[PDB]
Coordinates of N, CA and C in Angstrom, one line a residue:
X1 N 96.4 109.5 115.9 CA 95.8 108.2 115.6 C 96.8 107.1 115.5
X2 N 98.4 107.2 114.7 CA 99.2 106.1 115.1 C 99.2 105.6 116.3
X3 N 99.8 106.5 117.1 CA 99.8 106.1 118.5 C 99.0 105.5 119.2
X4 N 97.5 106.3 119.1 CA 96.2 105.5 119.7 C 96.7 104.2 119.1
X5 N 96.2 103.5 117.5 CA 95.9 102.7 117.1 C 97.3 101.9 117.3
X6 N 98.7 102.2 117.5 CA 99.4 101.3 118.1 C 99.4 100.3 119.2
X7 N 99.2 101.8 120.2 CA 99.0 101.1 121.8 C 97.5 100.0 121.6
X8 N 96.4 100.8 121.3 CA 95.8 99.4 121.4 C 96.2 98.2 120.8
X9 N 96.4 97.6 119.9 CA 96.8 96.9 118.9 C 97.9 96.0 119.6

């Protein structure tokens, strides 16, 4: 989820 929610962001 970091990751997901990084890249989109």
């Amino acid at each position: 989820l970091a990751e997901a929610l990084h890249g989109a962001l």
